[PDB]
Design a protein around this nucleic acid. Structure first.
Ligand SMILES: Nc1nc2c(ncn2[C@@H]2O[C@H](COP(=O)(O)OP(=O)(O)NP(=O)(O)O)[C@@H](O)[C@H]2O)c(=O)[nH]1
Ligand SMILES: Nc1nc2c(ncn2[C@@H]2O[C@H](COP(=O)(O)OP(=O)(O)NP(=O)(O)O)[C@@H](O)[C@H]2O)c(=O)[nH]1
Ligand SMILES: [Mg+2]
Ligand SMILES: [Mg+2]
Ligand SMILES: [Mg+2]
Ligand SMILES: [Mg+2]
Ligand SMILES: [Mg+2]
Ligand SMILES: [Mg+2]
Ligand SMILES: [Mg+2]
Ligand SMILES: [Mg+2]
Ligand SMILES: [Mg+2]
Ligand SMILES: [Mg+2]
Ligand SMILES: [Mg+2]
Ligand SMILES: [Mg+2]
Ligand SMILES: [Mg+2]
Ligand SMILES: [Mg+2]
Ligand SMILES: [Mg+2]
Ligand SMILES: [Mg+2]
Ligand SMILES: [Mg+2]
Ligand SMILES: [Mg+2]
Ligand SMILES: [Zn+2]
Lengths: 95, 115, 37, 321, 311
RNA sequence: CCUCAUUGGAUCAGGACAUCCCAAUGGUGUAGAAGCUAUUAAUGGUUCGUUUGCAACGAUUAAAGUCCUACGUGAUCUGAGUUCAGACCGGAGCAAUCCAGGUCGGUUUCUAUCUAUUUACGAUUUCUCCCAGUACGAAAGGACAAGAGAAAUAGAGCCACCUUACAAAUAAGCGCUCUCAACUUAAUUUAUGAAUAAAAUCUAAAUAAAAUAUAUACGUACACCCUCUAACCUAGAGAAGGUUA
RNA sequence: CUCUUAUCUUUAAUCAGUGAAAUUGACCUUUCAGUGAAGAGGCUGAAAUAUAAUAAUAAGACGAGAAGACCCUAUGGAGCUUA
């Protein structure tokens, strides 16, 4: 995507309201030729993600944002602390 | 192609998979009307006595031209609510997952490398 | 519309008709009162 | 939300003489906790309210023991209070995984003992979800409570022009900018006393018991309401309100409550509002201990003036306890 | 050291073969000729397993509980066990070791006295006292036939005694046990339950050997030993398996046990470049041997149901 | 005084409707959403496993219907059982033997004479998107029709790619493509209007309409009278059929 | 096994030579409903219908075979045991 957007929300209710408002405005605001966008994560109760053609928005609760740390990964593409801990291995026989 | 009783490689950093255990995970169910599982198709694993949902992110069977064939059947674990269990994926993931009908944006966010 | 063997009126407003080869009691006030033979 | 249910325990199977042995205990009714949504299903779906259990199988040749009967179950809303037909509280399914032996299956028929068969117990059991609102509205007739609920929410409340109106309380959840929803229910105007269940009575007053807090509307016009000839002042009305509430239940008086002045729009009402300020707080010309919570705000429902101010006070008290 | 064994997501232990169903029918039909019913069980598990149907279906006749395998169990609080079992409504309970004929004499006098209180109706004239033994698999139910067969009649083994569950399949004919009271026994196949209660009880019920271990895997069960063995304080596996020091991780202990026993497999692992077959230590074999030592009593005496009995 | 002994599976399925899903409707203690009950309809469909010897569960699905065809079907195949020759325990009998008690072992073959049969069709279901987080509803929650797009399965075909073979010019699927119209009705709902003074009444009155599943009216396919030494063929068992500067 | 596929040999098929077996009341040997003892190519009533081959399937002819099973009978046998 061209732009990656992450925004926290007060509660689950607030999260649903923000997602619905953006989609409603998106359809109203032109995009007549452009196709439609799904709302993903409704089954999820704390993290909702909407992927527009050139932008992706992830709305999640504070604790979910803290655990996943999406900001760090995309800011630091290959130097994320969690990524660093993931090493590589091989498979030798045991003797 | 993943079926019932296939052996799978968890490609997350989640403890459920990451931890070395003498038995690999085996597929118990493929969520399709077709029994076969391809890229982007969910499956139910039996991993360490636990039944856990997962998503296929690559397989050894050939696909259509211009798509990547992997050497192992790769899978990511997703929670019941649909949020990924693990927080990082360092293995390349095909970009076809974006346009397949379904919810894959959460997994794509967690994946740094795309092929 | 219940298909019963005997048709009996249940209220004053109920009335009877012979449509499509069968007897009906049709009540406008209370649709519960509808019966077909 | 205060429905009733009848049940019947299974009968005990009769035994087989000459060493055939016992008969199976009749089936018993166990109300089983499930998703709270079941209350709508119970009252409406499966309208027949009789829950009966299979009687135990009679002892058969070869001295087969009884099947022990077939049990029956009632899915119920979480938080339901199980009470007898007489009103005695058998139990409450406050938490999940809370089954209750509401009815007793017929004692297993045993030929060796005194009784060959025995019939199952059957009873009427009240299962009720009396409105557990966050706060409740208690006021005398013509107070204005329905009008107050009308504007805070969009509930189209029945407006009680005369007494003994709006018998069923109307539940309304109040939305807030914080996305917090507070449920408020307005019951009908209550009569003085009512400890003997006069008129409207205290039967609906059980609904307030469930409510965490109490909301008191104070119609300024009610002050010196001639009626037949009580001519109750608002000062008197509050004293009667406190007294009658104590008689019905001591705990009700102790429960957190708030005060809502009404009908202040009229200039004379504003003069009375100063009289309302005078009444209570500092001692006046009294005509037992009583409680004044002091969460009193001056508003007029008809003009919709000061309504926003009261909303805040309510939420503060709620968030506190 | 861990705090609580993870039981989220694990399933219950469903075994219930067909013979445990056809059998249950024959047992019901045999009520005609049974004066008393004896429930055998594993002393290590006082309050679990315990197929409820036995009290339900076989409740017609008087009942007696015989907790077997007392030798490989901790019975310091035996007094406490009786107190609660009295509350359960099991006034008479017996602890017996079949292999070394411990306390097996007492059973017959109690059955005699117990029968005297009851009525016999149709069988009031028969002089032979026929009683019936039931219980879950591998509780010594078949052995109890032989231990009494010899203790009183001094004749010899008459019922096939085997380690693995399922040896005795159908309800058999009577087996003579004594001559003076002329007591016969009816042997029946072990039945567990159509539905065990909890994932833990089912996990415990596999420890003593009541259900085939492969239905549980033998890997979600070896872990349970280490938990309870360490929790209960019986740090005996370290000495027996010459481990470095106490531990609470299966991958570690089973790594040590496997090396000690010089057991390895050729196991296919799936790496990122394709399947590869790599020789590895037998984690599966160690789990079995670790289980088979526990069950043999060389790892110590245990009270799997603890803090449930005291209360 | 006691008692007790044909049926699973595989393959291929024909049919009933007393309908499990799909479709059209009446009633409601049907606000919406979920449900309940009844009418109509036989259209196509109606999953994969574990322990099992009958059930007992797991994960799914729009649904995992109930029955009849001599377990529908062993000259198509297969496991039990009936049930034996050997052998053990348990229980009988002085023994031989025996038990409608356990268990382990344990050979049915068939070249089809007759009938019958072996060369097209016009599609089902599910999810997502939109309408629209709207109508409704105090909130919670949350539709219908209309409209667009994806797959799954079935049917009919094909080989540019991919894959697997022949270490051949081919054949396959694990690859690719294509699938539609309804003249004719049932439950039910309307309009006009007599018997019957109505400013009534859908009508086994004369009338006008709408409305499941079915189906063949209506289409597509076929259609030519055909030389043959022989060779060749993406046609074929033979014969037939195609091709021949 | 999902879910089958390709190749080669055997057999098959066509040409030449040689040439059996069980089986067979007679047959100019059809479908549906009925009747009947669980039962019909052959009976009752409808219907269908130029004639002969070749290669295939196995629903039927309660298809063909063996010294197969099961119960009962005989003032038929025989082996075994005894009290
Ligand atoms: N002047 C004035 N009139 C008011 C005010 N609030 C309500 N009313 C009037 O009071 C009239 C009587 O009905 P009202 O008391 O509102 O109904 P209610 O609240 O349901 N009464 P009850 O207490 O019996 O349930 C209403 O018709 C309304 O016009 C107010 O603030 N000022
Ligand atoms: N240590 C010990 N082992 C015992 C004891 N009784 C029986 N066993 C063991 O348990 C096994 C025999 O079980 P068995 O007597 O057949 O009991 P069962 O319950 O009748 N068997 P089943 O599982 O078939 O129902 C053997 O491994 C035997 O050594 C005992 O008192 N102590
Ligand atoms: Mg069919
Ligand atoms: Mg029908
Ligand atoms: Mg046949
Ligand atoms: Mg043949
Ligand atoms: Mg012999
Ligand atoms: Mg065998
Ligand atoms: Mg052999
Ligand atoms: Mg045999
Ligand atoms: Mg032929
Ligand atoms: Mg639509
Ligand atoms: Mg020849
Ligand atoms: Mg002819
Ligand atoms: Mg016929
Ligand atoms: Mg004829
Ligand atoms: Mg020939
Ligand atoms: Mg034939
Ligand atoms: Mg004779
Ligand atoms: Mg003779
Ligand atoms: Zn009526």
């Amino acid at each position: 995507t061209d732009y990656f957007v992450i925004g926290s929300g007060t509660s689950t209710r607030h999260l649903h309201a923000m997602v619905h408002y953006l989609v409603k405005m998106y359809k109203h605001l032109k995009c007549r030729s452009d196709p439609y966008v799904k709302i993903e994560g409704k089954d999820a109760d704390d993290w909702l993600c909407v992927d527009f053609g050139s932008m992706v928005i992830h709305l999640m609760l504070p604790e979910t944002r803290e655990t996943y740390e999406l900001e760090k990964l995309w800011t630091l593409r290959s130097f994320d602390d969690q990524l660093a801990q993931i090493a590589a291995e091989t498979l030798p026989e045991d003797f | 192609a993943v079926q019932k009783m296939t052996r799978v490689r968890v490609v997350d950093n989640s403890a459920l998979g990451s931890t070395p255990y003498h038995r690999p995970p085996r597929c118990i169910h493929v969520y399709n009307k077709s029994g076969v599982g391809k890229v982007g198709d969910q499956i139910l694993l039996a991993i360490r006595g636990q039944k856990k949902k997962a998503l296929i992110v690559g397989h050894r069977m050939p696909g259509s031209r211009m798509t990547p064939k992997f050497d192992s059947n790769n899978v990511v674990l997703i929670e019941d609510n649909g949020n990924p269990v693990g927080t990082r994926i360092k293995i390349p993931i095909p970009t076809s997952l974006r346009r397949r009908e379904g919810e894959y944006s959460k997994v794509l966010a967690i994946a740094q490398n795309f092929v | 519309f219940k298909t019963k063997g005997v048709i009996k009126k249940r209220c004053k407003d109920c009335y009877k008709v012979k449509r499509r080869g069968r007897w009906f009691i049709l009540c406008k006030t209370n649709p519960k009162h509808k019966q077909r033979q | 939300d205060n429905l009733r249910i009848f049940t019947k325990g299974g009968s005990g199977g009769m035994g087989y003489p000459r060493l055939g042995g016992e008969g199976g205990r009749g089936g018993d009714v166990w109300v089983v906790a499930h998703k709270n949504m079941t209350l709508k299903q119970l009252k409406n779906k499966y309208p027949q309210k009789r829950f009966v259990a299979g009687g135990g199988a009679n002892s058969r040749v070869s001295a087969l023991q009884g099947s022990k009967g077939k049990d029956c179950e009632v899915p119920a809303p979480v938080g339901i209070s199980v009470t007898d037909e007489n009103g005695q509280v058998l139990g409450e399914l406050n938490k999940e995984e809370d089954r209750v032996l509401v009815a007793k299956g017929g004692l297993g028929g045993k030929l060796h003992t005194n009784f060959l068969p025995l019939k199952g117990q059957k009873r009427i059991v009240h299962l009720d979800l009396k409105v557990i609102a966050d706060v409740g509205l208690v006021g005398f007739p013509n107070a204005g409570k329905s009008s107050l609920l009308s504007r805070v929410s969009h509930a189209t409340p029945v407006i009680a022009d005369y007494a003994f109106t709006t018998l069923r309380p109307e539940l309304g959840k109040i939305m807030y900018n914080d996305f917090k929803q507070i449920s408020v229910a307005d019951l009908p105007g209550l009569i003085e006393g009512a400890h003997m269940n006069k008129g409207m009575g205290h039967k609906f007053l059980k609904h307030l018991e469930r409510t965490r807090q109490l909301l008191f509307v104070v119609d300024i016009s009610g002050f010196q309401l001639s009626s037949v000839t009580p001519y109750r002042t608002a000062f008197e009305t509050i004293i009667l309100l406190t007294k009658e509430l104590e008689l019905y239940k001591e705990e009700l008086q102790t429960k957190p409550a708030l005060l809502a002045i009404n009908k202040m729009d009229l200039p004379d009402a504003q003069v009375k509002l100063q009289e309302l300020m005078k009444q209570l707080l500092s001692p006046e010309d009294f005509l037992e201990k009583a409680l004044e919570f002091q969460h009193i705000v001056p508003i007029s429902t008809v003009t919709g003036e000061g309504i926003a101010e009261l909303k805040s006070c309510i939420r503060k008290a709620l968030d506190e306890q | 050291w861990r705090e609580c064994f993870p039981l989220q997501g694990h399933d219950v232990a469903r075994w219930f073969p067909g013979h445990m169903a056809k059998g249950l029918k024959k047992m019901q039909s045999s009520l005609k000729s049974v004066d008393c019913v004896i429930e055998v069980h594993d002393a290590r598990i006082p309050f679990s397993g315990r197929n409820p149907l036995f009290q339900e279906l076989l409740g017609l006749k008087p009942h007696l509980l015989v907790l077997n395998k007392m030798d490989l169990a901790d019975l310091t609080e035996q007094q406490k066990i009786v107190q609660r079992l009295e509350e359960k409504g099991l006034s008479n309970v017996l602890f017996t070791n079949c292999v070394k004929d411990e306390n097996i004499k007492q059973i017959v006098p109690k059955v005699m006295e117990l029968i005297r209180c009851s009525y016999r109706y149709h069988r009031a004239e028969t002089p032979e006292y026929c009683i019936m033994v039931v219980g879950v698999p591998n509780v010594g139910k078949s052995s109890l036939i032989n231990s009494l067969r010899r203790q009183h009649l001094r004749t010899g083994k008459a019922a096939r005694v085997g380690g693995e569950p399922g040896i005795t399949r159908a309800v058999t004919s009577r087996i003579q046990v004594c001559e003076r009271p002329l007591v016969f026994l009816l042997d029946t196949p072990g039945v567990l339950a159509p539905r065990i209660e909890s994932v833990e009880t089912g996990l415990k019920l596999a420890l003593c050997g009541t259900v085939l271990d492969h239905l549980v895997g033998e890997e979600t069960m070896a872990d349970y030993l280490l938990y309870t063995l360490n929790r209960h304080g019986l740090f005996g596996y370290v000495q027996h398996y010459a481990l470095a020091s106490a531990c609470d991780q299966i991958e570690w202990v089973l790594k040590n046990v496997a090396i000690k026993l010089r057991k390895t497999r050729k196991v296919k692992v799936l790496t990122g470049t394709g399947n590869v077959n790599v020789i590895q230590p037998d984690y599966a074999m160690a789990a079995r041997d670790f289980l088979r030592t526990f069950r043999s009593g060389l790892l110590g005496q245990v009270m799997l149901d603890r803090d449930i009995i005291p209360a």
